[PDB]
Design a protein around this ligand. Sequence first.
Ligand SMILES: O=c1ncn(Cc2c(F)cc(F)cc2F)c2ccc(Oc3cccc(-c4nc5ncccc5o4)c3C(F)(F)F)cc12
Ligand SMILES: [Mg+2]
Ligand SMILES: [Mg+2]
Length: 560
Amino acid sequence: SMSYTWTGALITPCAAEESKLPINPLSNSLLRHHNMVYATTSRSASLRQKKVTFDRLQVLDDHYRDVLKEMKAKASTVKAKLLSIEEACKLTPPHSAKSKFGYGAKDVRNLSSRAVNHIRSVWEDLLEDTETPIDTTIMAKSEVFCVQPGRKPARLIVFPDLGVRVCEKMALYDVVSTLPQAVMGSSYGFQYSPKQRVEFLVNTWKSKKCPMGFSYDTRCFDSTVTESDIRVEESIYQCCDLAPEARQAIRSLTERLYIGGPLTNSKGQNCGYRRCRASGVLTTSCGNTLTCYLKATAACRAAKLQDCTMLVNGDDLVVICESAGTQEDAAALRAFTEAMTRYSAPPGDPPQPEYDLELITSCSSNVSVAHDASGKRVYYLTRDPTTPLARAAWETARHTPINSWLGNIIMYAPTLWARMILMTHFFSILLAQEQLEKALDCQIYGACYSIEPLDLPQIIERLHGLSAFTLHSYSPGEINRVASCLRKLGVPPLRTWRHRARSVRAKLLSQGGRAATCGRYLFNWAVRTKLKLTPIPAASQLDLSGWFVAGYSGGDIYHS
Ligand SMILES: O=c1ncn(Cc2c(F)cc(F)cc2F)c2ccc(Oc3cccc(-c4nc5ncccc5o4)c3C(F)(F)F)cc12
Ligand SMILES: [Mg+2]
Ligand SMILES: [Mg+2]
């Protein structure tokens, strides 16, 4: 069937939308080529629509069937619980989109009876109506990027009302947080912290006689997802021991929301129909990871690829296997892609086989190596700084709900670019406005957390280890990439950053306390007379477990 059907009404904005980067006195310290930075607007929706709209083609075979059964067998072991309305309400973010029934995020978290009552209403309805298609809203997502030798058309977000959203949680939150793990095991990409991820890639890599890996990029994965896939996906959820209420809710949500439904623009007009995965629902992450793993695993048997391990993060997939020879690999890879095409997961960019782990890119990230205080090789997760930086610049000029910079510093703490640019820049600014104390929000795996800037040392040490503060002698490849990017966006030279860092470091050490701890560890790279960095007390006792459990992009999740 057609992934989408349009009535003609436009994808409309609910407020004015900024697209250019504001010439701000602060952002300018970061990068000078500000016209290279942009934000997507509904003004490009049409372009994105033409791409995400097409007729899916799917042919399932015995391999596909075999893997599904293997997957169902494992899910059979799961027993998912039903969340109460309070638990579900506590999971709602404060910024989350208000309901069209007289209540907003804040009311939900406060358990305001007007809200909680309508919520119960939607739930009762999910227990009685097993057919009626639930309304969704379509919007153009506003994200920051850096131009390219053109521009990226906005991405479309389809999401149900806050009411239906607190319910999805009530019936599927426990499921999407545990099932993927039970089914895919070591392959479930969201259970890892960046370091546990690198360790997993490296370990998997070194376990092959002659390794070979490749990343597979599906063309607009979300729309490749068919009704069949969605039902199959639910068939798995159904293997869980579930309270009657939840089993019904899942059955209904599957037929009324997940498999497809009507579309409405911000102006309340009928835009069309969706017969594929909605980005803004709770099951997107889990659903896509399971679906991708299913097809990919089944595809490897089809393409005769030998002993292949996989790491899946939603629509993002990377695969490592035993090389059978240069030409044979290129053969099987193509054989793979076709299998996936039949499964309705054609590639955006044809996949190319890699024989060096540093060249494989998954989750926009690659694995690279540097050295610690003692000169020991250290492996860490990195990526291209372009978008991170561009967004960092934008988040400097405008007040913004989520701070991609904070999250990026956390996830990429050991990288050269995060430590030299981001850490310096933001502390330099925070320190100024005396904001070092204020807590900020950011997202890790789509989930939303509230982080205190002054706890970055503990956090970083816990998730990465002390070496995150002393890595040096990065790879020439990471060095080249970083440089090119920094040069492209007009970022100040290394020296300007070393100076700026030496400065903020001093201003931090004087403040004493956590501030001193920040200056001491975070900026140890700037001073000639390095200090001895010892394990930070607070780090010793931190529960960063909930941080790396599952994915929740578009899931409307907030962990307090
Ligand atoms: O391997 C290293 N080992 C240690 N240090 C020191 C160091 C560090 F251990 C951590 C940190 F947090 C900052 C920092 F200093 C390096 C510092 C810079 C570098 O790479 C270079 C070298 C020369 C120029 C540029 C360079 N080209 C540029 N072009 C435009 C703007 C800025 C630029 O900087 C770069 C860089 F873009 F950083 F990758 C490599 C290393
Ligand atoms: Mg974990
Ligand atoms: Mg895609």
